[PDB]
Amino acid sequence: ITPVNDETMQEINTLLIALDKTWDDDLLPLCSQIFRRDIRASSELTQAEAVKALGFLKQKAAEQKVA
Amino acid sequence: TPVNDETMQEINTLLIALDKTWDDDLLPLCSQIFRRDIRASSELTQAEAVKALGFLKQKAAEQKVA
Amino acid sequence: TPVNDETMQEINTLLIALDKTWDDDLLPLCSQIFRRDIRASSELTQAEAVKALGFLKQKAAEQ
Amino acid sequence: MTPDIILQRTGIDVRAVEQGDDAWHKLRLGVITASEVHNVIAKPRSGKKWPDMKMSYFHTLLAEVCTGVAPEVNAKALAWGKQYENDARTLFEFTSGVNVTESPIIYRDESMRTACSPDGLCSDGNGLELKCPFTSRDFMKFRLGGFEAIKSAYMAQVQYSMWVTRKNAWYFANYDPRMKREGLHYVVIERDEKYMASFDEIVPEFIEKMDEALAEIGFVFGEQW
Amino acid sequence: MTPDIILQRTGIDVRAVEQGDDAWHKLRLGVITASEVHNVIAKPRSGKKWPDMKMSYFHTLLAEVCTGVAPEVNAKALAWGKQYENDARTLFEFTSGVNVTESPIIYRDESMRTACSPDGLCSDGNGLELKCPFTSRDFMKFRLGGFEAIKSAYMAQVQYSMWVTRKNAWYFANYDPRMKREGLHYVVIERDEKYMASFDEIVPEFIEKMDEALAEIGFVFGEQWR
Amino acid sequence: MTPDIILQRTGIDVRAVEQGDDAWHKLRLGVITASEVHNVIAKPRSGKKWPDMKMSYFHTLLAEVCTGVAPEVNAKALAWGKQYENDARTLFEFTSGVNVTESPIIYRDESMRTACSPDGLCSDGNGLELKCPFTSRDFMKFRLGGFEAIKSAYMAQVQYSMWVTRKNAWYFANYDPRMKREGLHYVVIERDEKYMASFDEIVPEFIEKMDEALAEIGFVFGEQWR
């Protein structure tokens, strides 16, 4: 039940901007698949889910060395 | 998928060489091992018949029939 | 197959020596370990009573 | 051993037993059976010390006496074997031309410490062991014959049966109903005096040690009946 | 090698079959597959006797031909793998940046004795092996890297896949959905010409021996598809 | 170490924790426990390279930290054990004459890296370890050999329990409800300083290496509990 805190939301947004990706086109579709749920807004994530999502962006970014 | 002519023929030749019959010997055996009431050779599938034939050949070999 | 008299007496012999009772000690013990409400000593099977006896004998041996 | 003497010492009528029955299991409790005797005759790397599989069977058998139960190992394999055993027997009879009577357990002597349970007794004097391997893999291993087709555990089993029954040969058949052809195969195994002597030497010692272990915890063989 | 030759040989349109499928199993019956080839290349510590694991796989594969069935081993692990394989593929795509198209079984040649079923074929020419290990234990072994992170069975599977497909590199990825972070890890494994030479010598011999054994009991490879 | 440090770090009140509950499992995640420490002190036949069972436990324990879960192992033996543990405690009280009080987990220090969950604490200052062996075979082994036929894995568990709690002796009792007589047997295992020294040397090295592995993948011990 515990929701995504603002700190985590910001780090996610920072990475989306650097990778040129978006919540609605990229991350929410991804999150919907891997968590087996219809997730249409960033606020529907748990913190644990958001941490996972943030981790996957960090992995993607780190390959490209993005900022 | 039903028993072909070739397989029926070899079965029937071996039954005669062995002095056994469909009704008394082979159909009871096939009924037991395939878990079904098989009342005629026409009720047998090719796969079943191939297994039956194998047993008859082994029976014939150990007997040393002509 | 029900508890026999000579086994029941071996049990009672030990209960008296140990200063224990059916109501306070042995029926609750047996009820727990055989997963059954055992209201009286005659409701033990022979096999059940042979186990209870073994444990009383072990308890006694250790004093 | 006669059918009344067994009844006289166990309360069970051998004439009314069906392999898998409660009574069938009770009769084998604490008895050195053919399926397990490969454990009895295991020798170590070197020296006089009993290997783990021997110690493990020893403890298993001792527990049978003291609990009056045998848990079943490999429930899938066992159910499979029970499903197809009579088909294997029938097909063995059919292909071999030899008639098969089912036998209750056969004790070697009056001690009832050593027994086998033949899957058949044959009209030519031979016994019959039947296997329905749970894997077609193992069927194939046997079916292809040659070096190491018959695992040594099963050779021990077959030889022990001949030791127990005094017999000179034993049929050993495998059946696999999944094989599209070649699903029933058998061999004749002859009494091997090297095995007979090994049993003559090692088996009495194994029985003696069991008696010592049972005495140490206030049990005696026979109690289980 | 095409789906028309597979069709003619087996009656199975490869294009309508997807990893796990009932027909997917039929296409593999009797075939030396990448996940098992480690059994085929095991050498004895000395002499020339086939080790137990090799003989055991020899007998398993022959039984598949003669029975037309292959029992499922490690049911829980296979179900876990099936549950998470597509997420593992998507996460690999997402994090690596490389695109992955799915592939049916790929036979090395017309004989159909040898095949692999890549978990994907990547945009950069490489294949993809995907594991969702049933225990997070094994995930961690791999994730930590080092000389020993990849089990030798898995190295053989990867190298065999390159041997079957003529490819020069393969992605080996693990996914664990239970990891709170770092749940997807991958490495690139290059074609190893020492493995290629072992396959070239040992596999055709293994095939010959299988044929002799099948013939010993009156079977012909390919029967399991007629 | 006290209830306060456990509350601050895990959120859990140890006084509410009875063996086997959700809380009990949570508190053991990532912790070197007595049942498993035999893997930590395993040494190779020659040298200093960690044997496979040690690496396997390292990986298991690291996964507990990073997933926050632990799978069940030997479901049947475990259910049997849970089925008969209370009867074994009762029968031990009854036959021995020493009162047993149940204890939640005990950590050796503030780190919470090392812990044991006694099956009981005895009125005479000894601990109590309780086995209900799944096979009567294993019961019979213990019943006859005594001290001589305690598995080294079990001996390590008892010694580590004394290492953690500082106690001098431990009751090791087996129970088998299938035994017609003689189904409850116990011995007193004394603290062995050779074991105490092994733990003093080896366990802190194990902890250090776990922290390094966790750091390599962006994790820190404690994450399991939040």
Curated annotation (Swiss-Prot), chain B:
Disulfide bonds: none
GO molecular function: DNA binding
Gene Ontology terms describing biological process: DNA recombination
Keywords associated with the record: DNA recombination, DNA-binding
Top-level taxonomic group: Viruses
Function: Gene bet protein functions in general recombination and in the late, rolling-circle mode of lambda DNA replication. Has a function similar to that of E.coli recT. It is a single-stranded DNA binding protein that can promote renaturation of DNA.
Name of this chain's protein: Recombination protein bet
Organism from which the protein derives: Escherichia phage lambda
Whole-protein coverage range: 195 to 260 of 261
UniProtKB/Swiss-Prot annotation, chains E, F:
Reactions performed catalytically: Exonucleolytic cleavage in the 5'- to 3'-direction to yield nucleoside 5'-phosphates
InterPro entries with a match to the protein in the record: NF-kappa-B_Signaling_Reg (IPR051703), PDDEXK-like_dom_sf (IPR011604), Restrct_endonuc-II-like (IPR011335), YqaJ_viral_recombinase (IPR019080)
Keyword Disulfide bond listed: no
UniProt GO molecular function: double-stranded DNA 5'-3' DNA exonuclease activity; metal ion binding
Keywords annotated in UniProt: Exonuclease, Hydrolase, Magnesium, Metal-binding, Nuclease
Gene3D superfamilies in the record: 3.90.320.10
Signal peptide segment: none
CDD domains linked to this entry: PDDEXK_lambda_exonuclease-like
Entry binding sites for Mg(2+): D119, E129
The protein's required cofactors: Mg(2+)
Enzyme nomenclature, EC number: 3.1.11.3
Record's keyword annotation contains Lipid biosynthesis: no
Subunit structure: Trimer of three subunits that form a toroid, with a tapered channel passing through the middle.
Protein task: Facilitates phage DNA recombination through the double-strand break repair (DSBR) and single-strand annealing pathways. Also important for the late, rolling-circle mode of lambda DNA replication.
Protein's name in the database: Exonuclease
